[PDB]
Amino acid sequence: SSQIRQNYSTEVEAAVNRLVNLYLRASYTYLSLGFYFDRDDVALEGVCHFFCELAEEKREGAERLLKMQNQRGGRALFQDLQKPSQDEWGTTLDAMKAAIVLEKSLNQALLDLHALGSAQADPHLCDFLESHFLDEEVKLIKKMGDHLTNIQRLVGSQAGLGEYLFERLTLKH
Amino acid sequence: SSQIRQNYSTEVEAAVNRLVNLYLRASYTYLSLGFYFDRDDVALEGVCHFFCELAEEKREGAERLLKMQNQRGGRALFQDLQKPSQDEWGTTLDAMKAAIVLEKSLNQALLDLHALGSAQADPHLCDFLESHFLDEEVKLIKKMGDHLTNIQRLVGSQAGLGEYLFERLTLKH
Amino acid sequence: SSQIRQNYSTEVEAAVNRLVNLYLRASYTYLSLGFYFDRDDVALEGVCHFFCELAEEKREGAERLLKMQNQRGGRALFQDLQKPSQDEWGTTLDAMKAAIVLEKSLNQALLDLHALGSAQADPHLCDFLESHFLDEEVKLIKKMGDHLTNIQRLVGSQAGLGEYLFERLTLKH
Amino acid sequence: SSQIRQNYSTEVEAAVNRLVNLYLRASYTYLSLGFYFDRDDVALEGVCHFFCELAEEKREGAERLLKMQNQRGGRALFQDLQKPSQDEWGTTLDAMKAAIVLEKSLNQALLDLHALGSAQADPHLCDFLESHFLDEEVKLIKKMGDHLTNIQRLVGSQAGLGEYLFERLTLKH
Ligand SMILES: [Ru+3]
Ligand SMILES: [Ru+3]
Ligand SMILES: [Ru+3]
Ligand SMILES: [Ru+3]
Ligand SMILES: [Ru+3]
Ligand SMILES: [Ru+3]
Ligand SMILES: [Ru+3]
Numbered sequence: 001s002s003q004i005r006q007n008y009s010t011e012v013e014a015a016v017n018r019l020v021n022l023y024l025r026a027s028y029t030y031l032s033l034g035f036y037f038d039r040d041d042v043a044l045e046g047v048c049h050f051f052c053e054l055a056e057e058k059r060e061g062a063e064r065l066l067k068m069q070n071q072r073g074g075r076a077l078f079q080d081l082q083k084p085s086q087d088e089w090g091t092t093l094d095a096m097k098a099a100i101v102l103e104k105s106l107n108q109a110l111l112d113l114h115a116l117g118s119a120q121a122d123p124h125l126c127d128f129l130e131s132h133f134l135d136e137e138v139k140l141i142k143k144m145g146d147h148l149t150n151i152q153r154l155v156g157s158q159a160g161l162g163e164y165l166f167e168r169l170t171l172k173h
Numbered sequence: 174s175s176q177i178r179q180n181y182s183t184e185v186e187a188a189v190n191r192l193v194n195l196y197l198r199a200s201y202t203y204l205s206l207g208f209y210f211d212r213d214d215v216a217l218e219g220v221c222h223f224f225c226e227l228a229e230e231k232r233e234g235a236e237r238l239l240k241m242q243n244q245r246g247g248r249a250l251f252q253d254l255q256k257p258s259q260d261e262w263g264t265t266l267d268a269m270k271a272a273i274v275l276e277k278s279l280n281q282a283l284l285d286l287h288a289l290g291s292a293q294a295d296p297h298l299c300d301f302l303e304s305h306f307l308d309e310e311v312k313l314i315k316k317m318g319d320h321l322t323n324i325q326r327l328v329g330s331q332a333g334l335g336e337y338l339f340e341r342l343t344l345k346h
Numbered sequence: 347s348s349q350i351r352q353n354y355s356t357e358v359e360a361a362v363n364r365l366v367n368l369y370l371r372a373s374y375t376y377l378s379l380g381f382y383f384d385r386d387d388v389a390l391e392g393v394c395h396f397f398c399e400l401a402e403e404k405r406e407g408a409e410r411l412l413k414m415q416n417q418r419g420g421r422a423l424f425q426d427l428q429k430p431s432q433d434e435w436g437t438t439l440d441a442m443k444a445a446i447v448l449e450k451s452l453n454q455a456l457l458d459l460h461a462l463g464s465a466q467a468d469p470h471l472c473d474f475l476e477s478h479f480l481d482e483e484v485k486l487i488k489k490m491g492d493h494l495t496n497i498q499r500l501v502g503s504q505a506g507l508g509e510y511l512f513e514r515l516t517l518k519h
Numbered sequence: 520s521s522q523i524r525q526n527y528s529t530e531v532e533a534a535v536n537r538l539v540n541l542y543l544r545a546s547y548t549y550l551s552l553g554f555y556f557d558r559d560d561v562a563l564e565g566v567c568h569f570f571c572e573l574a575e576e577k578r579e580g581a582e583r584l585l586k587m588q589n590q591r592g593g594r595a596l597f598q599d600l601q602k603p604s605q606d607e608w609g610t611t612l613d614a615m616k617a618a619i620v621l622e623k624s625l626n627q628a629l630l631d632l633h634a635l636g637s638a639q640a641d642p643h644l645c646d647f648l649e650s651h652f653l654d655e656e657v658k659l660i661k662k663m664g665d666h667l668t669n670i671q672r673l674v675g676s677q678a679g680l681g682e683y684l685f686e687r688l689t690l691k692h
């Protein structure tokens with residue numbers, strides 16, 4: 001049993017474990033997106049790299065949450081990771097829309113956990129989120145939004161040409 | 174239209190645009206102070222540098238607010254910048270008092286925006302202010318207060334001599 | 347009161363103060379252009395950089411004018427900076443046309459001030475403009491004209507694709 | 520006889536020779552000022568350095584005028600250099616006032632020669648002055664004005680103390 005736990009509610013402990021599951025689930029989704037874009041019949045290497053990097057970032061997010069859970073004297077509890085929502089992710093546009101949907105859901109979970117910690121007078125939890133997660137997520141969402149706009153600009157008339165150019169000229173490869 | 178905006182009230186968006194205007198206005202005030210101290214009949218180069226550096230800091234403050242406004246999916250709206258309150262700024266003492274008055278007003282605007290964001294459950298906004306503005310302003314005000322005290326100590330009997338020495342021995346030039 | 351002023355008419359002094367206001371106003375316009383292009387639903391980073399750099403150049407222009415005003419024994423007088431003419435700037439093409447319109451107006455103001463200084467037999471003023479402003483403005487206008495031509499070439503049939511390519515392949519990002 | 524002279528009036532040639540004499544005369548004045556401040560009963564080394572450096576600058580000015588006179592095919596003609604106006608230069612304040620009087624007279628001579636060259640359609644002469652003399656003189660006069668203001672600020676009550684501090688804290692030594 002913990003000899004350190006202090007000001008760390010059971011409600012926050014449980015919500016941290018759920019947020020871990022949401023981050024790991026997001027990582028898994030991004031692994032599936034990344035490998036889809038590496039298929040021989042899709043073959044958009046910059047898209048593949050973008051999602052593979054997100055998979056790693058989301059995993060790191062989960063690991064930071066787990067580290068904090070132990071630092072506070074909470075107990076990590078793991079659940080199943082549900083498989084991603086799709087087996088094939090459509091076009092780069094479809095994929096980036098799906099990514100923004102996912103990130104908005106993670107952001108709302110962060111916000112919901114921050115509200116819980118504020119209500120429970122848990123300022124360490126609030127600070128931990130503010131310092132490692134909230135701004136990182138806002139910056140990520142802004143980048144995805146920027147990408148989506150450029151993707152959309154490029155569909156117009158000649159969607160294949162637009163998809164190739166976005167991958168070649170915007171995404172790292 | 175934004176595809177990213179999330180938990181970002183119209184009230185905060187508008188108050189961020191007003192704070193931008195307040196920061197730019199402060200920058201403009203400091204440009205006028207700086208150039209006043211560069212006049213041939215004033216000629217206090219360290220005072221000139223101190224205000225010119227503040228002009229740049231306030232501009233940077235505004236640009237960081239604008240960047241954040243876009244990161245959140247808000248829309249920057251610019252108003253007129255009102256000319257500074259004075260055309261001539263008196264002595265170094267008068268000027269540093271005017272500077273502290275200005276900074277207190279900016280600080281109160283920061284505090285008012287932080288209170289708004291807390292009431293709207295906007296922790297990213299609160300964190301953004303805490304991390305980039307609130308402490309920076311407290312440190313600045315403390316430095317201006319320190320300066321004012323040393324300026325005041327030096328008036329006593331021989332105000333011209335005191336004004337020269339402060340500029341030469343405290344301010345960078 | 348100045349002990350240095352020599353061959354520096356009240357007419358030139360006033361026109362220098364107006365040119366300062368025109369340069370600051372141009373800087374402000376360029377700040378608004380820059381931030382428009384950073385919006386999530388516009389997202390043209392090279393365009394954003396181009397205008398942000400112009401904002402800084404115009405500010406520097408104003409500061410050089412103010413420095414000269416003091417060097418000559420004139421007195422800087424600041425007015426309101428009027429907000430930019432538009433809140434949203436349309437396409438890259440619309441924006442670069444607006445930029446060239448702005449620059450032509452600044453150029454005409456430079457030319458008008460040079461004519462004034464020639465009529466007043468103020469060769470230092472004339473030289474100051476020739477050496478720091480007139481050629482810089484001609485080079486800038488030529489660059490904007492070059493850009494506009496390439497933008498225009500690229501609209502043809504597929505305006506979104508053209509806008510993306512210009513930003514990616516011409517503008518620094 | 521010159522085989523090169525072109526667009527170089529006898530009037531400009533003569534006025535260039537007079538300006539040489541005015542610059543050398545200014546150099547001589549500054550030599551006398553410099554050595555006055557090196558006297559054992561004056562002993563203000565930073566003041567001595569400031570004037571000794573001006574002596575050298577004025578000499579260099581004359582040499583540049585003479586070089587140009589030959590470049591244009593004119594003939595240098597030298598007159599007597601009149602001794603400086605005073606044998607003893609009073610206080611630093613008296614000296615800096617005398618310096619500004621001298622520089623204003625040189626500036627007016629530059630301006631008068633520029634007006635002559637403009638009337639004679641001698642753009643090389645005009646450019647030569649604009650590029651090597653007019654701005655250099657404006658910057659110098661502004662520096663002397665700045666100094667005079669700081670000197671004046673420091674007299675107030677305790678003129679000896681003010682004179683020492685100016686020399687120690689403003690002037691290079
Ligand atoms: Ru790959
Ligand atoms: Ru991959
Ligand atoms: Ru200065
Ligand atoms: Ru300054
Ligand atoms: Ru940008
Ligand atoms: Ru920008
Ligand atoms: Ru010496």
Ligand SMILES: [Ru+3]
Pocket residue numbers: 553554557567568570571
């Ligand atoms: Ru000397």
